[PDB]
């Protein structure tokens, strides 16, 4: 169904420790396909997925060229914001930039966005309409007035609705075997006595893709969202994902509690329960 391409830029000043570190990473939905590391030896946008490697030399010359320029801009930006906030050249600060486009089943532009942050906090974001900006504070306001006069939103827009989707469609096609598949979650359940009086039921879900998924526990057809442990969805590392949800129940009710798996990768929701 829906698809997206997102890029993430992180710059961290390092007073005394030399010039700032600039790291970049490209994601097509839940798959990273490229990266750039101002510290590495290559100094080239590098591939991080099989399907993207097939792009030719001029693609990589272009990405490295455009990424270098992007890091130079964030390097000056780093010293500029230090001033806007009257900080010393002693601490290390960070600038984060994330932007991308979303397309629906027919690969037609759906949503587009761009947001920048300073020291983990919002700085300036492009509005939903892709025509104006939203500044977080007075320092960000300086940048806003300028970007509005320099027509920055228009360049961002022409890209989000244009090349951004153009490349997402080409990526979704050149790497179908990875990007368009849907790996359903291989379920399973475990029980661990806590005591002769209580025990823990853990609902597993490994090797699934995309990451989107929902594990929920129920009391005879009643969901219990406040006595159940649930961890953050995590990367197995092979490209797939995993997750589990737990619950603590009396020594006699392990047939009153059902766990439901839901993932676009499986025709019908699962209703696991111990035995």
């Amino acid at each position: 169904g829906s698809h997206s391409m997102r890029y993430f830029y992180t710059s961290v000043s390092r007073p005394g420790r030399g010039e700032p570190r600039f790291i970049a990473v490209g994601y097509v939905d839940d798959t990273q396909f490229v990266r750039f590391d101002s510290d590495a030896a290559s100094q080239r946008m590098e591939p991080r997925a099989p399907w993207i490697e097939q792009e030719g030399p001029e693609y990589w010359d272009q990405e490295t060229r455009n990424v270098k320029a992007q890091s130079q801009t964030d390097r000056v930006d780093l010293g500029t914001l230090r001033g806007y906030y009257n900080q010393s050249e002693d601490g290390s600060h960070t600038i984060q930039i994330m932007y991308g486009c979303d397309v629906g089943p027919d690969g037609r532009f759906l949503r587009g966005y761009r947001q920048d942050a300073y020291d983990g906090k919002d700085y300036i974001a492009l509005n939903e309409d892709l025509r104006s900006w939203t500044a977080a504070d007075m320092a960000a306001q300086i940048t806003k007035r300028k970007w509005e006069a320099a027509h920055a939103a228009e360049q961002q827009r022409a890209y989000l609705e244009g090349r951004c989707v153009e490349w997402l469609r080409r990526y979704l096609e050149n790497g179908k075997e990875t990007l368009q598949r849907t790996d359903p979650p291989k379920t399973h359940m475990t029980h661990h006595p806590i005591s002769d009086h209580e025990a823990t039921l853990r609902c597993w879900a490994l090797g699934f893709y995309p990451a989107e998924i929902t594990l929920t526990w129920q009391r005879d057809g009643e969901d219990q969202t406040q006595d159940t442990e649930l961890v953050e969805t995590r990367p197995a590392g092979d490209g797939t994902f995993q997750k589990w949800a737990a619950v603590v129940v009396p020594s006699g009710e392990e047939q009153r509690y059902t766990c439901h798996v839901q993932h676009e990768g499986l025709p019908k929701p699962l209703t696991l329960r111990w035995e």
């Binding site: 490229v34 992007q70 940048t143 300028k146």
Partner: peptide
Amino acid sequence: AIFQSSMTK
């Protein structure tokens, strides 16, 4: 791929 027109802040 990536955006090539980011302006200074």
